[PDB]
Each structure stands twice: as structure tokens, then as C-alpha cells.
């Protein structure tokens, strides 16, 4: 577990692909479209919310 | 999808509050997984894994 | 259908895969969505087998 | 937060990425979801085909 959401994204970028992070799809789809373009949303969603 | 109630009905708000209670308790996702994947006659999971 | 049996008093509530639209919200009270969905694609399982 | 500034009169409406939950529906009137989402997975896509 990480302290804040900013620490969760930085942990996947420095894990050489050996660590995953679970979060909401809206925040996940936005990080995929921001530099250095090193994240990717894989698979569908787990729950239904809005 | 949603549950429809007549306008001004006494069950309008109590049912709306009950739907959110089932979504957070995992009941809605449990029923979704019941009549889709549990009781599903999915043969591709056994014909494609030989 | 089911929306008519609520405005006309022939039913007290309707629990079914009823699409939440604007034209239906003006006559009925819709609850929160218990199942999110959207337009998807359906194809045949490619054997290949080519 | 934003839900507090609505029950306490410090704001008339709150337009923001606010999670529609049951504990918040009991004090506020939540509109229909304008953006469906859910828990997803984030991984660094390799970038390893050296």
C-alpha cells in the first residue's frame, strides 16, 4: 500500500513492470495520456460506480 | 439500468437508498456474477483449454 | 409496457433492465444505476484453424 | 469538503468528480452519473523487446 495516489503511480514507473496499482478508471485513463506515456489501462473495470 | 417508481410514491426514496446499499455491500456484483458466469453454460473455457 | 403500468397505477414499482433515459425520467422516478453498460462489439471466436 | 459546503449552505451546487455513495446520498441529492468508472489495473507496458 502507498500513502497517496501520487506515490502509487511513481512506484509502477520504477518497478520495471514488476508492480501493479489498482485505482479508478477515470484517473487511470488520464495517466495513460500524460508523459512519459509509461502507463496503460489493462482489462475492464471491477465494480460499477459513477 | 434502473428501478422505476411513480412520482411522489412513498417507495421512491427508500428504494433508491436500498440500491446503493446493495452496490457497496457487493450484492449487485455478486448477483451479476451469478446469472452470467456461474450459471452460464460457457464451453469455451473448457474447449479452448485442452 | 412497464413504464405505462406505473403512471397509470396498474403497478407500484418496476424492477427490470430498463434503460435510464431522459424521456422516462420526466414521468417516472428512476433509482441509481445498478448495472452500468454500453454499446460493445460481438464477433465469432476465430479458430484459425487457417 | 464539497459535500460539507452543501449541507452547511456555503455552496448551492457541487460540480466535481464526486463518488456517488450511499453515505452521501442520505445528506445530498445526487444527479444521474455523468461518467461511469470502476477499479482498473495500471502497469508499465514493456518496452522490453530489446
CA angle D25, D20, A34 (to 5 degrees): 155
Q: SS3 for D34?
A: coil
Å from A11 to nearest chain C CA? Answer: 31
A12 CB neighbours in chain D (<8 A) are: 42-44
Long-range (24+ apart) CB contacts under 8 A made by B8-17 are B9/C12, B9/C13, B9/C29, B11/C12, B11/C13, B12/C29, B15/C13, B15/C31, B16/C29, B16/C31, B16/C32, B16/D25, B17/D22, B17/D25, B17/D26
CA distance A5 to chain B (A): 22
- Closest residue, chain B, to D20 (C-alpha): B20
C17 labelled binding-site residue: yes
Closest Cα in chain D to C21:
D32
d(CA B22, CA B20): 5
B21 CB-near residues (< 8 Å, 6+ apart): D22
Mark yes or no for CB contact C12/B9 under 8 Å.
Answer: yes
| Binding residue positions of A | 24
Q: Parallel, antiparallel, or unpaired for β A21-24 and B2-6? A: unpaired
Residue C18: burial class (beta carbons within 10 Å; 0-12, 13-18, 19+) = middle
User: Which chain A residues touch D if contact means CB-CB below 8 Å?
Assistant: 9, 12-13, 15-17, 20-26, 28, 31-32, 38-50
Provide, as residue numbers in chain A, all residues whose Cβ is less than 8 Å from the Cβ of C35.
48
Identify the experimental approach: X-ray
Q: Is the dihedral of CA B20, B35, A47, C35 positive or negative?
A: negative
Residue of B nearest to A45 (CA): B29
Q: Is B21 on the interface with D (CB under 8 A)?
A: yes
By the 8 A CB rule, do C19 and B1 touch?
yes
Amino acid at each position: 500500500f502507498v500513502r497517496t495516489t501520487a506515490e502509487g503511480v511513481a512506484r509502477v514507473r520504477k518497478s520495471k513492470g514488476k508492480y501493479a496499482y489498482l485505482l479508478e478508471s477515470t484517473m487511470n485513463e488520464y495517466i495513460e495520456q500524460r508523459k512519459p506515456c509509461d502507463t496503460m489501462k489493462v482489462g475492464g473495470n471491477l465494480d460499477s460506480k459513477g | 439500468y434502473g428501478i422505476a417508481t411513480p412520482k411522489g410514491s412513498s417507495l421512491g426514496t427508500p428504494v433508491n437508498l436500498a440500491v446503493l446499499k446493495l452496490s457497496e455491500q457487493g450484492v449487485l456484483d455478486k448477483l451479476k456474477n451469478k446469472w452470467w458466469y456461474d450459471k452460464g453454460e460457457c464451453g469455451a473455457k473448457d474447449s479452448g483449454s485442452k | 409496457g412497464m413504464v405505462g403500468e406505473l403512471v397509470y397505477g396498474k403497478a407500484d414499482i418496476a424492477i427490470a433492465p430498463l434503460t435510464i433515459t431522459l424521456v422516462r425520467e420526466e414521468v417516472i422516478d428512476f433509482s441509481k444505476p445498478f448495472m452500468s453498460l454500453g454499446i460493445s462489439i460481438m464477433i465469432k471466436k476465430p479458430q484459425k484453424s487457417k
